[PDB]
Design an enzyme around this catalytic site. Sequence first.
Site, short mmCIF file in Angstrom:
data_model
loop_
_atom_site.label_atom_id
_atom_site.label_comp_id
_atom_site.label_asym_id
_atom_site.label_seq_id
_atom_site.Cartn_x
_atom_site.Cartn_y
_atom_site.Cartn_z
CD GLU A 144 -26.02 -34.72 -82.44
OE1 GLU A 144 -27.12 -34.19 -82.26
OE2 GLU A 144 -25.02 -34.54 -81.69
CB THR B 175 -27.98 -33.96 -79.22
OG1 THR B 175 -27.63 -32.86 -80.06
CG2 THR B 175 -29.22 -34.70 -79.71
CB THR B 176 -25.26 -29.57 -77.17
OG1 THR B 176 -26.35 -28.68 -77.43
CG2 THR B 176 -24.78 -30.00 -78.50
CG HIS C 99 -20.43 -25.86 -78.78
ND1 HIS C 99 -20.94 -24.83 -78.03
CD2 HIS C 99 -19.43 -26.40 -78.05
CE1 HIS C 99 -20.28 -24.75 -76.89
NE2 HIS C 99 -19.37 -25.71 -76.87
CG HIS D 176 -25.01 -32.22 -84.67
ND1 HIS D 176 -24.50 -31.85 -83.44
CD2 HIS D 176 -26.31 -31.83 -84.65
CE1 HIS D 176 -25.45 -31.27 -82.73
NE2 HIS D 176 -26.55 -31.22 -83.45
CG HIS E 142 -30.52 -31.52 -85.13
ND1 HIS E 142 -29.59 -31.78 -84.15
CD2 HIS E 142 -30.86 -32.72 -85.66
CE1 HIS E 142 -29.38 -33.07 -84.09
NE2 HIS E 142 -30.14 -33.66 -85.00
CG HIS F 43 -27.83 -26.87 -84.92
ND1 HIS F 43 -28.99 -26.56 -84.25
CD2 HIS F 43 -27.47 -28.11 -84.54
CE1 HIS F 43 -29.33 -27.61 -83.52
NE2 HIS F 43 -28.44 -28.58 -83.70
C1 LIG Z 1 -31.01 -24.02 -73.59
C2 LIG Z 1 -31.00 -22.71 -74.33
C3 LIG Z 1 -31.74 -21.61 -74.06
CL1 LIG Z 1 -32.87 -21.52 -72.75
C4 LIG Z 1 -31.41 -20.63 -75.01
N1 LIG Z 1 -31.99 -19.28 -75.10
O1 LIG Z 1 -31.34 -18.41 -75.67
O2 LIG Z 1 -33.10 -19.06 -74.63
N2 LIG Z 1 -30.53 -21.13 -75.83
N3 LIG Z 1 -30.27 -22.44 -75.42
C5 LIG Z 1 -29.32 -23.37 -76.03
C6 LIG Z 1 -29.72 -24.80 -76.34
O3 LIG Z 1 -29.23 -25.68 -75.63
N4 LIG Z 1 -30.42 -25.08 -77.49
C7 LIG Z 1 -30.35 -26.29 -78.20
C8 LIG Z 1 -31.13 -26.45 -79.34
C9 LIG Z 1 -31.10 -27.64 -80.05
C10 LIG Z 1 -30.30 -28.69 -79.65
S1 LIG Z 1 -30.30 -30.17 -80.60
N5 LIG Z 1 -28.77 -30.48 -81.04
O4 LIG Z 1 -31.08 -29.83 -81.75
O5 LIG Z 1 -30.78 -31.18 -79.76
C11 LIG Z 1 -29.51 -28.53 -78.52
C12 LIG Z 1 -29.54 -27.34 -77.80
ZN LIG Z 2 -28.44 -30.52 -83.00
#
Ligand SMILES: Cc1c(Cl)c([N+](=O)[O-])nn1CC(=O)Nc1ccc(S(N)(=O)=O)cc1
Ligand SMILES: [Zn+2]
Length: 258
Positions: A104, A196-197, A62, A94, A117, A92
């Site tokens: 975003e 946001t995902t 993604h 976008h 982000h 990361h």
């Molecule tokens: C939910 C979850 C867990 Cl719990 C774990 N883990 O390994 O413990 N990984 N993730 C994935 C996740 O969704 N992270 C995420 C971070 C930042 C954004 S953003 N675009 O910066 O809003 C969106 C998603």
């Molecule tokens: Zn993000």
Amino acid sequence: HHWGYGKHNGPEHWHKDFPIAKGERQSPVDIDTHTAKYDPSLKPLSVSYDQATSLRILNNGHAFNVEFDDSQDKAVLKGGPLDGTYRLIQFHFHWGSLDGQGSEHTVDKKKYAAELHLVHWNTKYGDFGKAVQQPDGLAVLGIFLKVGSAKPGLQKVVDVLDSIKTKGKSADFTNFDPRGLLPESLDYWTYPGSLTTPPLLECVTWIVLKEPISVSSEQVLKFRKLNFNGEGEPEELMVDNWRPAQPLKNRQIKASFK
Ligand SMILES: Cc1c(Cl)c([N+](=O)[O-])nn1CC(=O)Nc1ccc(S(N)(=O)=O)cc1
Ligand SMILES: [Zn+2]
């Protein structure tokens, strides 16, 4: 048929698997600069990245993540709107298929070419997985990218992308200093929002810097060579991996600056 950014699995479909998509504190949002209220009670943001320990860079299908060892009190975000200490776990981006879209968050409806982000978790919840279940679990520092002069501190990231072209590739990526991705000013907007995902969890205090960083056209062109697909699959370029602005509903965006 899992979520992504296409016509049949993109942002307008996410609510079926993740009904919180239509929730009361979803991200991103449009930042209306004239409606955001200056809050003189907001503190300067404290970004302490001197001891950050990058480990690895991952293409997760993604976006790509630069991961950090978050097992000690290193690389932390405090102050600003936050209570207590938040530890950096990953960053990361976008970005768009063209320079005219990719961010975003938007600023008075302006879309930037990309958005960085830096993701941090509140140390009162012990680790990231518990933190995302809390309304004050995460703090994400968002930084806009515009196309102009190159960002020298981004180049180490750009150059490793050829080794993670595809979903599931990772490379050792030690010693990357995220201070090289920060603009001069730490003036910011802040509001309560979400990931946001998917899973779109409503656990984020968003801190969006006013000042964009400049990256070169060649740098962002290299982001656009990444692939959403796995190795030996039909090529679908990793572009337009951004969620559009969501309804503000009952929220206030606060500015740290006049
Ligand atoms: C939910 C979850 C867990 Cl719990 C774990 N883990 O390994 O413990 N990984 N993730 C994935 C996740 O969704 N992270 C995420 C971070 C930042 C954004 S953003 N675009 O910066 O809003 C969106 C998603
Ligand atoms: Zn993000």
